[PDB]
């Protein structure tokens, strides 16, 4: 009947690359790119890291905060755009790595950068219906931007997991409701063959990102009968810093409300991990009774909205695992050569 987050966990790799390092190679003005997107740097996975490892690190951190035995997890869902295998599931390797196996169901989720929040909704349903006791939903990605392209300044790796439960005394946050707005939109895609995606350019913004994010934000607030004044914090999808702020400002959110959710200027766009990671940072700082609005976005033309309320149990779990902001500041910078080496961007 009542559904909520019992545990959450996050992971960010140590390597970074500044905008300046990429621009230098491609003959662009860093201050121009830096100003435009409000991106300063991004995270870079180690060559021995991928979405599966990133998901496992975050999953394990979520179990620490939950403080529950992983044998009780009855479903694991991993939302990614960069699952290591095209057929073998990531969720299964994560389940094995937490020792939730074998009494569980799992599935790998695809829906551009919305994949992560899609599974949160799936876990909500299964726990709420009583079919499972706890479900885990993960949003993780090791995004790769085309070398010449602008997506190269933002594309980044990161992950975040959420454990959903029904026990009142275990919840650190409570779902008040969810809403989704989905259409068929060819703003951005990647076809089975291709290694790098193709985009529609300016058609990605107003008609796609804003259309779905704002409709989903409006829809949840109509469903809950609320206003922008009712929410303490907010997190939107962050392809670029600009898009995030424009959306927040458009709905009437002040910097104090949206400041905690925006990580892209120093993390980059972690695609399916973006909002999950943002939400995790809000939860790291949030006080009891804080109302949160979280709206995700996925290129195919989808948005997931959440209405969350924080619980007094927050103070207890926050320090049980690494804070999102601590992972984000534990960092090593690299140049572009090492970066293309790490990413396997160079032909071998």
């Amino acid at each position: 009947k009542d559904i909520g987050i019992v545990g959450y966990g996050s992971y960010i790799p140590k390597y970074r690359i500044k905008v300046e390092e990429i621009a230098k190679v491609w003959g662009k003005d860093p201050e121009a790119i830096k100003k435009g997107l409000v991106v300063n740097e991004k995270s870079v996975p180690s060559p021995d890291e991928d979405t599966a490892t990133i998901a496992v690190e975050a999953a394990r951190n979520a179990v620490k905060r939950a403080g529950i035995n992983a044998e009780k997890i009855g479903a694991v869902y991993v939302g990614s755009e960069s699952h290591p295998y095209a057929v073998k599931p990531t969720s299964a390797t994560v389940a094995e790595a937490i020792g939730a196996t074998p009494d569980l169901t799992a599935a790998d989720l695809e829906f551009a950068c919305k994949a992560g929040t899609a599974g949160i909704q799936m876990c909500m349903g299964l726990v709420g219906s009583g079919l499972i006791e706890y479900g885990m939903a993960i949003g993780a990605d090791t995004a790769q931007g085309a070398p010449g392209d602008a997506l190269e300044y933002t594309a980044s790796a990161g992950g975040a997991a959420y454990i959903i439960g029904n026990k009142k005394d275990e919840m650190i946050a409570v779902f008040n409701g969810t809403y989704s707005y989905t259409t068929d939109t060819p703003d951005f895609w990647r076809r089975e063959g291709q290694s790098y995606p193709k985009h529609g350019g300016r058609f990605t913004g107003e008609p796609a990102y804003f259309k779905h994010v704002l409709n989903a934000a409006k829809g949840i607030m109509e469903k809950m009968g609320t206003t922008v004044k009712d929410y303490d914090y907010c997190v939107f999808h962050q392809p670029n810093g600009k898009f995030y702020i424009k959306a927040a400002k458009s709905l009437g959110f002040t910097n104090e409300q949206y400041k905690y959710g925006l990580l892209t200027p120093y993390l980059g766009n972690t695609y399916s991990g973006a909002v999950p990671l943002g939400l995790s940072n809000i939860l790291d700082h949030a006080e009891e009774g804080a109302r949160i609005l979280a709206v995700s976005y996925g290129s195919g033309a989808g948005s997931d909205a959440f209405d969350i309320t924080v619980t007094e149990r927050i103070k207890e779990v926050v320090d049980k695992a690494p804070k999102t902001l601590d992972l984000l500041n534990r960092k090593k910078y690299i140049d572009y050569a090492v970066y293309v080496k790490y990413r396997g961007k160079i032909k071998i």
Partner: protein
């Protein structure tokens, strides 16, 4: 493909025409003289690649195909025979200015994707002196 094939001797070797009635040199070669019309007698004339920068610009955001060259110098070169041409200049963006003596160079101007035809032609380079 076919369009490339027609203006090869021009792009490759800078072969224009000379009007004997006028004395004027034309490049690219013209079928009809703008001044004399049908009166103009045309003979093929081989231009030296030598010229001077008449004006120039630096392209900072070109089509996705010129990603490697960005930023590049595009210029209008006044050739020593008289004709002016538009072409890129192989030099540092800080080293270009109006009046710089340049010389034509045979370069890979374009390609029709991964599978299509490669298109060669002139690109100017500053003289050593």
């Amino acid at each position: 493909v076919v369009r490339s094939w027609r203006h090869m001797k021009e792009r490759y070797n800078l072969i224009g025409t000379r009007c004997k009635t006028c004395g004027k040199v034309y490049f690219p070669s013209r079928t009809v003289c703008p001044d004399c019309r049908r009166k103009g007698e045309l003979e093929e004339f081989q231009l030296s690649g030598k010229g001077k920068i008449y004006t120039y610009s630096i392209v900072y955001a070109p089509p996705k195909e010129f990603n490697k060259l960005t930023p590049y110098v595009i210029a209008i070169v006044e050739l020593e025979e008289g004709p002016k041409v538009t072409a890129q200049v192989d030099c540092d963006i800080n080293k270009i200015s109006i009046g710089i003596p340049v010389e034509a160079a045979f370069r890979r101007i374009k390609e029709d994707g991964k599978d299509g035809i490669i298109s060669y032609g002139y690109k100017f380079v500053p003289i050593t002196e």
